[PDB]
Design a protein around this ligand. Structure first.
Ligand code: CLA
Ligand code: CLA
Ligand code: CLA
Ligand code: CLA
Ligand code: PL9
Ligand code: LMG
Ligand code: LMG
Ligand code: SQD
Ligand code: LHG
Ligand code: HEC
Ligand code: BCR
Ligand code: OEX
Ligand code: CL
Ligand code: CL
Lengths: 56, 32, 29, 242, 137, 333, 33, 96, 32
């Protein structure tokens, strides 16, 4: 939100500001990557759960 | 039911490996 | 998993060679 | 003068002829005459394959690859008609010669990319008014890229186009609607782009040399899968004859 | 099944005239064919040019017609292409080029008739096997 | 007298495994070939054996099991050319062209040849007779035939026997279609050598076991009737000969244990020697008997035999083997 | 690769020299009698 | 996804000698076409019609009438890339 | 490779069960 507000302050449209956000940064802001959301016998990689992330 | 396919061998080896260990030790104790 | 199984068996055989040679039952006259 | 027994096994057989640094002259083109290329030679030094992007939809880059088919990549003895068209511009029309070489390169990850490095039916033109072929003369045109395998080629299960089975015989009662792309073979024919940049000219012999850059598609395995975008760079040598 | 005279009866020229070979004559034409032809013409095919065979149907459509004794003997003297547009004795064994094809030197006129006959008789015995290839082996 | 200490340990008879001077070459080479084989059999990428840009997968990680797995022969483009690692621009190229194959078999053939010599060496150190190595020459020649001699005569290591189970079968089938090895009197002597070997092995084994002198009871193994290094023979050859001499006739049986055992060595070794030479001679295209269209009736019709049926089977392998590698009607290479 | 070639060449030479000098070191004498 | 080669067998190509696709070896099935005229036909291919084969430069009056006697055995379909590439018209990989 | 899902367990038991049988017999022999 700090990076978006900075973009809006520089005179960019709402579509431009959010487009400047790295997909890697948005991916960190997703509870599926939270290590406190798994299960003891939910085995394997995280991609076995929510799936393999393709795009934002 | 769509269970874990590795669940079968994991359960079987969970039983066999330590059970065999005890059977080995026992039989060789009686033969003494 | 097939590969792991094939290699595991092969590994056991090689191990068996080592024990059948250096830790064999010593032949006595 | 070198002979075959001096070159055999050295790798120089895959090397295009070169011109010394003192060859920056110009070969005059007289519109009254008819010209030809008696020998065109293309030696690739770098193969670039465009990575198939994730889902980012931003520009896909060409990554460096490694050649595994050794020194079997050079085109040579390519001859054709060099026409002087109305606006003074020159245009080369490829006719015959060793105008193709199968090449397999390996990408990071281990993926192998077979491709038919070729310039078949090349028609490359220059800018208008070329009184002489100088060291700033550029040749740009297009060529045909035929299928990597021809029509008689049989896959490991004996399927093909002009020959072979037309189904998966190992699976007699399998639904063929899924294996349709692997059962039905297709012969590809795509277009290629290439730019020949002259850097050296010997006006007394009619010999030119420089670097080229071509863009084409790789092998599609007779329609089995999608081809890759391949870029080939290297040097070239050509001799002009009236 | 035997080697009857009607089997050994082969066309002489291109206007209906025929000739009945003897059994020994056929055995001679067989021996001479193995001597100077078999290398390229085993079973009626052509190893150095599989597009042309020694089948009677093929010989008939040649120019000039080669489905007779008169035609084959002439070919063994002055061989030409299938259309007869050019002479090829320089690359095909013949009396005309027996200097570069030494096996054609000791071949008499009688020897050529027997060979020509064997070429015509054999497909009447083997059928489509003659000039068929490995398919009919 | 320092180099002498090294020589004594090398030729030492008190080592658990004898080293020897042949072993000085044998041990590194065999280890080299073995290590490379294990790695290649598991993790090697596909190999373009026929040199037509058609890579053949042979390793486990690339979709093979134990039965279908193989180390694939070097490319036909290479031929008989020596192709070490340092002759390739990269390991990727080296693997694509069948590099591991040459590395293994060359280290192996060297190691195996030294193995034979190593057998003579220990026998000399122990005061034995030295011809056990001569018996080992029979399988060693067989390995030399399919790994070295046949590629030489054919002009490529791509026509060498692949290092795999299915690849071996591929070698046998293609071989029959081109050489008719079955109708070759040397393979037939080889078959007679291995069938007879197995027969005589079962035969000798049964007759000695049958004539075992009772030293044990019914509640224990008969093997415990023999002690390692005992002076007395564990069986009765007189009784054994009495039996086998009546099974056929006495003059068809051996009363001499030395003469009998020599026959046991001679028969399969000589047999394998011939089938070894069979591959070696067929390497230069001196092929098996050809009786195709040999029987002819009075008219001239071909009367087929069992040989012509064999031919039809050979035709099937021929026209299908390496379906993309032939551009001309005659299969010479 | 040049480094590898030199390395193997030296390794091979070393062992071959052991084989030659080894058997030249009175091998017939090395027997029980 | 259709096999163009099989699909081309359902056209005139499967009945007559296609002057734009058929391998040169098929000209042997008729009199005086192989190999002279056969080479000329394939070389000057393709043709928009069968009769265009009569306008090949260098033909003699004898050659023209031979072609005329075999027009009924000829046909012309669209050039198939799968039949003309790799020099298949001169060698389709089929012998005996 | 789409292999049999029972291949792993069938192979594991084929090794383990008779080999365990042998091991058991051996250890009770050395103890005698
Ligand atoms: C410190 C140890 C450790 C850790 C933290 C991890 C972590 C990981 N491993 Mg690894 N792994 C380890 C050791 C470890 N591994 C070892 C030693 C091996 C060799 C056998 C492996 C073999 C291995 C494989 C083959 C795989 C992983 C995978 C994984 C991932 C998923 C793990 C999972 O789902 O577990 C599940 C955990 C459990 C179900 C918990 C088990 C609890 C036990 C059964 C309790 C036992 C209780 C006892 C019997 C009772 C006693 C009673 C008392 C009275 C005595 C994760 C990244 C997976 C992956 O993503 O690969 C890409 C995968 O496929 N690991
Ligand atoms: C016992 C040791 C030994 C031997 C005999 C060999 C032999 C071989 N190795 Mg191996 N290798 C060895 C150890 C050995 N290796 C070890 C320990 C390693 C691990 C580092 C390797 C790693 C290795 C690699 C990576 C490669 C080889 C390869 C080779 C081959 C070519 C070697 C070469 O060019 O030598 C050149 C040596 C000489 C010219 C010797 C010069 C000096 C002598 C005295 C000259 C006279 C020789 C003459 C034959 C007489 C000998 C005496 C007597 C028999 C009469 C050959 C099959 C290559 C291969 O397989 O290519 C396909 C290959 O790529 N080796
Ligand atoms: C029905 C049984 C039978 C018999 C009698 C034979 C017999 C023969 N087979 Mg055949 N074979 C058989 C089954 C049989 N085969 C089967 C089921 C298979 C698998 C499908 C094969 C596969 C096979 C192959 C692949 C080959 C043969 C060959 C042979 C020959 C040598 C075999 C040999 O040395 O064996 C080993 C056994 C011995 C050495 C013991 C002695 C055997 C001889 C023949 C006994 C002679 C007795 C004598 C006539 C008695 C004299 C009495 C008095 C005057 C003193 C021989 C002609 C080989 C061949 O073609 O050779 C020309 C060959 O290459 N066989
Ligand atoms: C009943 C049928 C039959 C029989 C009995 C035989 C019998 C034989 N065939 Mg024939 N064959 C048959 C049918 C048959 N064939 C058919 C139908 C075909 C046509 C498809 C063929 C095609 C054919 C071919 C093409 C070849 C044979 C060969 C052979 C021989 C194989 C054994 C051999 O070479 O041992 C010799 C022993 C060895 C090769 C082993 C060497 C081992 C080295 C020294 C050491 C290895 C160590 C190892 C790597 C590690 C050990 C580890 C351990 C210490 C822990 C034998 C004479 C082969 C032959 O004659 O080879 C000379 C051969 O090349 N056959
Ligand atoms: C209805 C009616 C008429 C009823 C009447 C019946 C009647 C009264 C009949 C009587 C008349 C009559 C005799 C009829 C028979 C007619 C007839 C000809 C029958 C023959 C049939 C026939 C051809 C049979 C086959 C013959 C045959 C088996 C030949 C075998 C030849 C052969 C393979 C020999 C090899 C033997 C050999 C080399 C052995 C050595 C190799 C070896 C490993 C030996 C192992 C070994 C050997 C030892 O030696 C000892 C010591 C020990 C330790 C040992 O390891
Ligand atoms: C040698 C002994 C014999 C072999 C073991 C015999 C079985 C013993 C029990 C094993 C149970 C393992 C889980 C079974 C389910 C399964 O299939 O897992 C299978 C998992 C893998 O999980 C798989 O992953 C795949 C992709 O790689 C897919 O996603 C599959 O769907 C998924 O099942 O195997 C493992 O995770 C092994 C590593 C386990 C690490 C545990 C770390 C924590 C350990 C805590 C120990 C202290 C607590 C206990 C103290 C007392
Ligand atoms: C990747 C490549 C990695 C390669 C790593 C390099 C290898 C490291 C090896 C370590 C050397 C020391 C270990 C010796 C073990 C040993 O065997 O000692 C076992 C015996 C013990 O040796 C005795 O040891 C005692 C002192 O500890 C005695 O006093 C004597 O000194 C000594 O003779 O070794 C011998 O008897 C000598 C002969 C050695 C035989 C080597 C066999 C080589 C086999 C080659 C073929 C194998 C390939 C196919 C496999 C199937
Ligand atoms: C018109 C052609 C004319 C011929 C032309 C040449 C043809 C070839 C001739 C070859 C002659 C060879 C003679 C060999 C003598 C010998 O080996 O003695 C060695 C022993 C001595 O016997 C033992 O001999 C002893 C006496 S003595 O001391 O040896 O003199 C005696 O005490 C003992 O009882 C006895 O068993 O012989 C035997 O033990 C008998 C069985 C040996 C069989 C021959 C050896 C194996 C042959 C090949 C087998 C595989 C072939 C088939 C493979 C599929
Ligand atoms: C108890 C017998 C069991 C035999 C089963 C196998 C039969 C095979 C077909 C017939 C073979 C004919 C040849 C016999 C040859 C013959 O004559 O045998 C005879 C022999 C008895 O001989 P003697 O008692 O005279 O032996 C004297 C001793 O001093 C040994 O020398 O019988 C056996 O050895 C039994 C053991 C066989 C074991 C074979 C291997 C079994 C492997 C089983 C693996 C199971 C895996 C399970 C996984 C879940
Ligand atoms: C290898 C050098 C050959 C030998 C030996 C013989 N012939 Fe041949 N022949 C050969 C070729 C390559 C061809 C076809 C080429 C061409 O354009 O003709 C032929 C053709 C014939 C023909 C014509 C068949 C036809 O369809 O018209 C005939 C009649 C013929 N050859 C006969 C013949 C005889 C009798 C031979 C033994 C003396 C003989 N040929 C040997 C190649 C070779
Ligand atoms: C953990 C893990 C895993 C695996 C597991 C396994 C499977 C293991 C195994 C292991 C093993 C199974 C091991 C083995 C080993 C063996 C050995 C180690 C042996 C050795 C031997 C030797 C060394 C010997 C040698 C010799 C000599 C010395 C000389 C003579 C010859 C001989 C050869 C004898 C998995 C994959 C799941 C996953 C990941 C993790
Ligand atoms: O590569 Mn393996 O096999 Ca001796 O033959 Mn020719 O090449 Mn290929 O065909 Mn048949
Ligand atoms: Cl094959
Ligand atoms: Cl070829």
């Amino acid at each position: 939100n700090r990076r978006v507000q900075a973009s809006l302050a520089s005179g960019a449209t709402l579509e431009e500001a959010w487009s400047a956000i790295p997909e890697k940064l948005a991916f960190y802001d997703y509870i599926g990557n939270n290590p406190a959301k798994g299960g003891l016998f939910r085995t394997g990689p995280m991609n076995k759960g929510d799936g393999i992330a393709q795009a934002w | 039911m769509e269970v874990n396919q590795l669940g079968l061998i994991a359960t079987a080896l969970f039983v066999l490996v330590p059970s065999v260990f005890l059977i080995i030790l026992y039989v060789q104790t009686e033969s003494q | 998993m097939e590969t792991i199984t094939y290699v595991f068996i092969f590994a056991c055989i090689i191990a068996l060679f080592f024990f059948a040679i250096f830790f064999r039952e010593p032949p006595r006259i | 003068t070198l002979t075959y027994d001096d070159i055999v096994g050295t790798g120089l057989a895959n090397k295009c002829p070169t011109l010394d640094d003192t060859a920056r002259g110009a070969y005059p083109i007289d519109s009254s005459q008819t010209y030809r290329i008696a020998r065109l030679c293309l030696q690739p030094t770098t193969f670039l394959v465009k990575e198939e992007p994730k889902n980012k939809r931003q520009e896909a880059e060409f990554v460096p690859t490694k050649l595994v088919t050794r020194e079997t990549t050079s085109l040579d003895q390519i001859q054709g008609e060099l026409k002087v068209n109305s606006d003074g511009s020159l245009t080369f029309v490829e006719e015959d010669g060793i105008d193709f070489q199968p090449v397999t390169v390996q990408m990071a990850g281990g993926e192998r990319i077979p491709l038919l490095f070729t310039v078949k039916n090349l028609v490359a033109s220059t800018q208008p008014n070329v009184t002489s072929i100088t060291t700033s003369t550029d040749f740009k045109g297009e060529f045909n890229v035929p299928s990597y395998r021809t029509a008689n080629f049989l896959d490991p299960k004996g399927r093909g186009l002009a020959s072979g089975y037309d189904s998966a015989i190992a699976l007699p009662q399998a639904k063929e609607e899924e294996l349709a792309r692997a059962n039905v073979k297709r012969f590809s024919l795509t277009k290629g782009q290439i730019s020949l940049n002259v850097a050296k000219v010997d006006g007394r012999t009619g010999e030119i040399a420089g670097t080229f850059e071509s863009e084409q598609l790789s092998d599609d395995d007779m329609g089995a899968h999608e081809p890759h975008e391949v870029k080939i760079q290297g040097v070239f040598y050509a001799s002009i004859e009236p | 099944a035997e080697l009857t005279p009607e089997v050994l009866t082969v066309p002489l020229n291109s206007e209906g005239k025929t000739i009945t070979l003897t059994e020994k004559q056929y055995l001679e034409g067989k021996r001479l064919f193995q001597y100077a032809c078999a290398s390229c013409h085993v079973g009626g095919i052509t190893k150095t040019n599989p597009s042309l065979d020694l089948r009677t149907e093929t010989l008939a459509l040649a120019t000039p017609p080669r489905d007779n004794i008169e035609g084959l003997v002439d070919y063994m003297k002055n061989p030409t292409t299938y259309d007869g547009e050019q002479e090829i004795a320089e690359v095909h064994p013949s009396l005309r080029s027996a200097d570069i094809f030494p096996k054609m030197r000791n071949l008499t006129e009688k020897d050529l008739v027997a060979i020509a006959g064997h070429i015509l008789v054999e497909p009447k015995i083997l059928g489509d096997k003659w000039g068929g290839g490995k398919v009919y082996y | 007298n320092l180099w002498e200490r090294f020589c004594n340990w090398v030729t030492s008879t008190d080592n658990r495994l004898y080293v020897g001077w042949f072993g000085v070459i044998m041990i590194p080479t065999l280890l080299a070939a073995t290590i490379c084989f294990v790695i290649a059999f598991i993790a090697a990428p596909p190999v373009d054996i026929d040199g037509i840009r058609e890579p053949v997968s042979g390793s486990l990680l690339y979709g093979n099991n134990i039965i279908t797995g193989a180390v694939v022969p070097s490319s036909n483009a290479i031929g008989l050319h020596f192709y070490p690692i340092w002759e390739a621009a990269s390991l990727d190229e080296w693997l694509y062209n069948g590099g591991p194959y040459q590395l293994i078999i060359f280290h192996f053939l060297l190691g195996a040849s030294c193995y034979m010599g190593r057998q003579w060496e220990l026998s000399y150190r122990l005061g034995m007779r030295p011809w056990i190595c001569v018996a080992y020459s029979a399988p060693l020649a067989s390995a030399f035939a399919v790994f070295l001699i046949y590629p030489i005569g054919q002009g490529s290591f791509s026509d060498g026997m692949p290092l795999g189970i299915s690849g071996t079968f591929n070698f046998m089938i293609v071989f029959q279609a081109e050489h008719n090895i079955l109708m070759h009197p040397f393979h037939q002597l080889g078959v007679a050598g291995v069938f007879g070997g197995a027969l005589f092995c079962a035969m000798h084994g049964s007759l000695v076991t049958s004539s075992l002198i009772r030293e044990t009871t019914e509640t224990e193994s008969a093997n415990y009737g023999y002690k390692f290094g005992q002076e007395e023979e564990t069986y009765n050859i007189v009784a054994a000969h009495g039996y086998f001499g009546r099974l056929i006739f006495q003059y068809a049986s051996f009363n001499n244990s030395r003469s009998l055992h020599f026959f046991l060595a001679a028969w399969p070794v000589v047999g394998v020697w011939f089938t070894a030479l069979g591959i070696s001679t067929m390497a230069f295209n001196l092929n098996g008997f050809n009786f195709n269209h040999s029987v002819i009736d009075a008219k001239g019709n071909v009367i087929n035999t069992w040989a012509d049926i064999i031919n039809r089977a050979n035709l099937g392998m021929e026209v299908m083997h390496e379906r993309n590698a032939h551009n001309f009607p005659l299969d010479l290479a | 690769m040049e480094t590898l070639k030199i390395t193997v060449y030296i390794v091979v030479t070393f062992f071959v020299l052991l084989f030659v000098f080894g058997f030249l070191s009175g091998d017939p004498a090395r027997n029980p009698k | 996804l259709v096999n163009v080669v099989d699909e081309k067998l359902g056209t005139a190509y499967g009945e007559k000698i296609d002057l734009n696709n058929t391998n040169i070896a098929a000209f042997i099935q008729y009199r005086g076409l192989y190999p002279t005229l056969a080479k000329l036909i394939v070389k000057n291919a393709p043709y928009e019609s069968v009769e265009d084969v009569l306008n090949i430069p260098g033909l003699t009056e004898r050659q023209k009438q031979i072609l005329r006697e075999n027009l009924e055995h000829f046909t012309v379909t669209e050039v198939e890339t799968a039949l003309v590439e790799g020099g298949d018209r001169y060698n389709n990989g089929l012998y005996k």
